[PDB]
């Protein structure tokens, strides 16, 4: 640690010091009596910001929870989260791209270099409130959002013995001692499995029949062809389902 002199009044029968959780926190020099602190000098995980390598190769190392004096080495910039080497500070304020902590977001902007800066929250706007002012829309617009919720997952299942003790008498025996440590595992896993199919059942099988839409698609003008299944398809998925099944690998 950093042996700094203390003002802890060690009563003359006292030898060491300690803290809440049994950490040496003052000592007595055995040659010449005096009481001094102890504090272990800073550590903290390095973190490497980076824009996509498919765009550049400039990194921005961020040391965590360190003062910008022990960092051994440019354009050092001290922030609330640690010492941030590699980004020139900025007065502007843009949205967040690569977060850091306590309001520091990095980016790759303009001959270019990583910049760090205090993030923004949106263009400040003022509502012209007044006790006789109302503002009523005249023209609407329809949108279409997109929400993607997982439902099931890989219904795995593991044979305890083959994994742990694949094909050996002695290993099956030495596993016969630990009792029910196999059976309870597979029990939990098949619980997971069966409830997966329960998940799918609940999500999709809300309908009791199978409906089919007539051939004449005179839907007031709207055009569903991208979402309604196509007969000429090999498996009767629609178009957008088809785009979807390819994105995921």
């Amino acid at each position: 640690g950093v042996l700094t002199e203390s003002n802890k009044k060690f009563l003359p029968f006292q030898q060491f010091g300690r803290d809440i959780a049994d950490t040496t926190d003052a000592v007595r020099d055995p040659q010449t009596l005096e009481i001094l602190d102890i504090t272990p000098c800073s550590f903290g995980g390095v973190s490497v910001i980076t824009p996509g390598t498919n765009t550049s190769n400039q990194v921005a190392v961020l040391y965590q929870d360190v003062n910008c004096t022990e960092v051994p080495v440019s354009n050092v910039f001290q922030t609330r989260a640690g010492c941030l080497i590699g980004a020139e500070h900025v007065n502007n304020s843009y949205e967040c791209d690569i977060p850091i902590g306590a309001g520091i977001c990095a980016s790759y902007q303009t001959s270019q270099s990583i910049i760090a800066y205090t993030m923004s929250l949106g263009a400040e706007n003022s509502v012209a409130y007044s006790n006789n002012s109302i503002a009523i829309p005249t023209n609407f617009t329809i949108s279409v959002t997109t929400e993607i919720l997982p439902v099931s997952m890989t219904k795995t299942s593991v044979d305890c013995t083959m994994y742990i003790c694949g094909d050996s008498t002695e290993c099956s025996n030495l596993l016969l001692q630990y009792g029910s440590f196999c059976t309870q595992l597979n029990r939990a896993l098949t619980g997971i499995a069966v409830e997966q199919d329960k998940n799918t059942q609940e999500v999709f099988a809300q309908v009791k029949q199978i409906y089919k839409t007539p051939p004449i698609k005179d839907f007031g003008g709207f055009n569903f062809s991208q979402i309604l299944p196509d007969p000429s398809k090999p498996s009767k998925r629609s178009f957008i389902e088809d785009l979807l099944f390819n994105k995921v690998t």
């Binding site: 006790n131 006789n132 002012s133 109302i134 503002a135 009523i136 829309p137 005249t138 023209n139 609407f140 617009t141 329809i142 949108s143 279409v144 959002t145 997109t146 929400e147 993607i148 919720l149 997982p150 439902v151 099931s152 997952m153 890989t154 795995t156 994994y163 742990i164 003790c165 694949g166 050996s168 002695e170 290993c171 030495l174 596993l175 630990y178 440590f181 595992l185 939990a188 896993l189 997971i192 409830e195 997966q196 998940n199 609940e202 999500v203 999709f204 809300q206 007031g220 003008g221 709207f222 055009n223 991208q226 979402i227 957008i240 389902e241 785009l243 979807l244 099944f245 994105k247 995921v248």
Partner: protein, 249 residues
């Protein structure tokens, strides 16, 4: 078209808005579908959630299988070697260490899978709710089924999880106005049966609250209450009587 008129009327926009802008909304909905198709076909990072689920599971499986090649303190990780190198009086010890290790690895894997499964089940119950409340009906839980007032939805499957296309509704073009909570026509106030009062400067109008449409003030969209001394901000006006043209002729 009649289902759509109902789904408007469900968010306080009298259907005449719809049946009078059918082609326009048709084109808006189609174009929206198109932009969605392009967005899905262009940005591979639209499917982040499902991709993350799959990757988490694959990572878990891979570390689980990699565990098999670790000593955990044994003289080897190839079970058969210990089984083909040591007499049972010591193979017992070695294989015991290996079994303890691999068993602990299995156990942690199972626990992780349990917690992740509970997470997925939470998302699945949320999905079931969204399906039953927006696909099969029409929601009013604001910002449950897409930013904006809500119209409908369309499920579209995807590998291990569903995807919605929330057809919401959003007003666009706005107009300052001069509102007033009442109208004192004969000393007795006149509040609106529905929607705000407005005026453009010289004539007072009542209108809806989400699509500016003026209506001259007859005594059928306004209901009386008391007299015009207790209201604050009540403003004088005339409130026409529709029955006069019938009686005068």
């Amino acid at each position: 078209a009649m289902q759509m008129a109902y789904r408007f009327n469900g968010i306080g926009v009298t259907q005449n808005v719809l049946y009078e802008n059918q082609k326009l909304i048709a084109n808006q909905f189609n174009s929206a579908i198109g932009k969605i198709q392009d967005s899905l076909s262009s940005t591979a990072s639209a499917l982040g959630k499902l991709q993350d689920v799959v990757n988490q599971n694959a990572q878990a499986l891979n570390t689980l299988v990699k565990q098999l090649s670790s000593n955990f303190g044994a003289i080897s990780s190839v079970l058969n070697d210990i089984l083909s190198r040591l007499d049972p009086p010591e193979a017992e010890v070695q294989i015991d260490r290996l079994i303890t290790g691999r068993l602990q690895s299995l156990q942690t894997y199972v626990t992780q899978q349990l917690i992740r499964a509970a997470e997925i089940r939470a998302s699945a119950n949320l999905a079931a709710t969204k399906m039953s409340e927006c696909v099969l009906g029409q929601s009013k839980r604001v910002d449950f089924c897409g930013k904006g007032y809500h119209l409908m939805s369309f499920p579209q499957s995807a590998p291990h999880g569903v995807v919605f296309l929330h057809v919401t509704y959003v007003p666009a073009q706005e107009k300052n106005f001069t509102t007033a909570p009442a109208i004192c026509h004969d000393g007795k106030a006149h509040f609106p049966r529905e929607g705000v009062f407005v005026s453009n400067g010289t004539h007072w109008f009542v209108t809806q609250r989400n699509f500016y449409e003026p209506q001259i003030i007859t005594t059928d969209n306004t209901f009386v209450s008391g007299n015009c001394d207790v209201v604050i901000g009540i403003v004088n006006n005339t409130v026409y009587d529709p029955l006069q043209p019938e009686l005068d002729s």
